[PDB]
Amino acid sequence: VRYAATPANPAKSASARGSYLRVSFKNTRETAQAINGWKLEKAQKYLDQVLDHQRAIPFRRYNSSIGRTGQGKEFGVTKARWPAKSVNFVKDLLRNAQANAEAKGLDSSKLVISHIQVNHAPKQRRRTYRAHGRINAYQSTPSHIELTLTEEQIRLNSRQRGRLASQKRLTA
């Protein structure tokens, strides 16, 4: 399998994947962007506080007509949520990549979430029933998630040279 981003030094990196996960893509994109570039331990503590509603995930792109909260002030937003299913899937993938780094001999206190991204997975179809005998779509929008933990002359003209030389001769 090919990751979207290859690590610069593969010997100091560990990766994890989750494909066809039946979790909301939009929520999972927001929770991945909330911990992109963080220390692994800091992000793990943060995701625990999100599950405990002590802190929130800022919703930045897929946030139309969602509620406002005071727990978004930390990130300079008003729209934030606490997506538990997405947080749990991301925590599972962080746990897996940390196990892979330990199996590589890397140090967990130095690990940083250097790469994480969410792609659309193929939809899962269902049916909903509508007024006047109509059928509509009731699809799921699943997620692919992947992540990587990384341990932390001048050439002058003839007259430009002439001016430079004559200026040196003025200064003795």
Partner RNA sequence: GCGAGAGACCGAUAGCGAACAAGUACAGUGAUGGAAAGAUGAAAAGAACUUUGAAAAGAGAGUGAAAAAGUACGUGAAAUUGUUGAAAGGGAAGGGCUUGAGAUCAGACUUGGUACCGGGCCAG
Partner RNA sequence: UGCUGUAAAGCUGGGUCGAACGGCCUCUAGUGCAGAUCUUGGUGGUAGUAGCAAAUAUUCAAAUGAGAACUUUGAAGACUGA
Partner RNA sequence: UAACGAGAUUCCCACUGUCCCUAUCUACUAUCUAGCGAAACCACAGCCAAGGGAACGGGCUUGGCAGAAUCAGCGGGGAAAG
Binding site for Mg ion (CB under 5 A): 65, 129, 133
**Residue 42 interacts with, from Mg ion, RNA, none (CB under 5-8 Å by kind):** none
Which residue in 45, 48, 54, 99 binds RNA (CB under 7 A)? 99
Binding mask 5-44 for RNA (x = CB under 7 A): x--------xxxxxxxxxxxxxx-x--xx--xx-------
Binding mask 55-94 for RNA (x = CB under 7 A): ------xxxxxxxxx--------xx-xxxxxx-----x--
The amino acid present at 53, given as its one-letter code, is H
Q: Which residues contact 27 (CB under 8 A, 6 or more apart)?
A: 62, 81, 83, 85, 86
Nearest distance from residue 60's CB to Mg ion, in Å?
16
H/E run at residue 16: strand 13-21
Count of alpha carbons within 13 angstroms of residue 129, beta-carbon side: 1
Q: Does residue number 128 form part of the binding site for RNA (CB under 7 A)?
A: yes
Cα–Cα distance measured from residue 112 to residue 150, given in angstroms and rounded to the nearest whole number? 5
Class of residue 90 by CB neighbours under 10 A (exposed 0-12, middle 13-18, buried 19+): buried
Which SS3 state, helix, strand or coil, does residue 2 take?
A: coil
**Residue 133 interacts with, from RNA, Mg ion, none (CB under 5-8 Å by kind):** Mg ion
Terminal-to-terminal C-alpha distance of the chain: 69
Which residues carry a binding-site annotation for Mg(2+)?
65, 129
Which residues of this chain interact with RNA, rule CB under 7 A?
A: 1-5, 14-27, 29, 32-33, 36-37, 53, 61-69, 78-79, 81-86, 92, 95-97, 99-100, 103-104, 115, 117-120, 122-124, 126, 128, 136-141
